[PDB]
Nucleic acid binder design. Structure first.
Ligand SMILES: [Zn+2]
Ligand SMILES: [Zn+2]
Ligand SMILES: [Zn+2]
Ligand SMILES: [Zn+2]
Length: 215
RNA sequence: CGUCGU
């Protein structure tokens, strides 16, 4: 029960993804023990890839509401502050309607349910930016397929993601979806990078979503 | 002027 957090912390320390070989070069287990532990926690915690790689993930999500009334089993926090980027950490302190206490008692309890309470703020941020689609740039609501040319402000090119929103939440079931499931697209990667997500992070998001899509 | 906003 405590071994899973141990692994996650190391994965989160190394960008959220490590090869199985490189993982073994950090721990005191033979490959047989490690590999059977990853399978146990399941793909909602560790996504396994083909050399072999492991991608860290979690079901834990940040509440999307501006103001939320309990009950709610999501984390409640300022994403910006978690990333250390909220400009209202010092000067106003108010005018940010979101919690700057990452490890609040309500949050600590959510973290417990997802077996993440041993994580520091940096690891938690690493895990969430690649697991919680709420940390992604806005997805274009008018986008309808790459065989169209819809009004995303033609004279001012769309600054939003043109991908399938259902895919990002692991819920695309459309037989022959027309919306892109390809996050590694050049223009997507640019918006992603502008938003603070490197191509390495997007690749992890891509692989987590792919795993969820191949249900 | 689309959520988290010098
Ligand atoms: Zn909530
Ligand atoms: Zn804030
Ligand atoms: Zn668009
Ligand atoms: Zn889709």
């Amino acid at each position: 029960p405590e071994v899973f957090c141990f692994i996650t912390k190391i994965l989160c320390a190394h960008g959220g993804r490590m090869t199985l070989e490189e993982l073994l070069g950090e721990i005191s287990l033979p490959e047989a023990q490690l590999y059977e532990l990853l399978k146990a926690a399941g793909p909602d915690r560790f996504v396994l890839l083909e050399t072999r790689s492991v991608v860290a993930t979690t079901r834990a999500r940040v509440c999307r509401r501006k103001y939320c009334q309990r009950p709610c089993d999501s984390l409640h926090l300022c994403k910006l502050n978690l990333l250390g980027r909220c400009h209202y950490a010092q000067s106003q302190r108010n005018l940010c309607k979101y919690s700057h206490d990452v490890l609040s008692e309500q949050n600590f309890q959510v973290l417990k349910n997802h077996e993440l309470s041993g994580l520091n703020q940096e690891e938690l941020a690493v895990l969430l930016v690649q697991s919680d689609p709420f940390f992604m740039p806005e997805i274009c609501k008018s986008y309808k397929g790459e065989g169209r040319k819809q009004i995303c402000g033609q004279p001012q090119p769309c600054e939003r993601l043109h991908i399938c929103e259902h895919f990002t939440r692991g819920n695309c079931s459309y037989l022959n979806c027309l919306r892109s499931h390809n996050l590694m697209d050049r223009k997507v990667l640019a918006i992603m990078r502008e938003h603070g997500l490197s191509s390495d992070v997007v690749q992890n998001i891509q692989d987590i979503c792919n795993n969820k899509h191949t249900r």
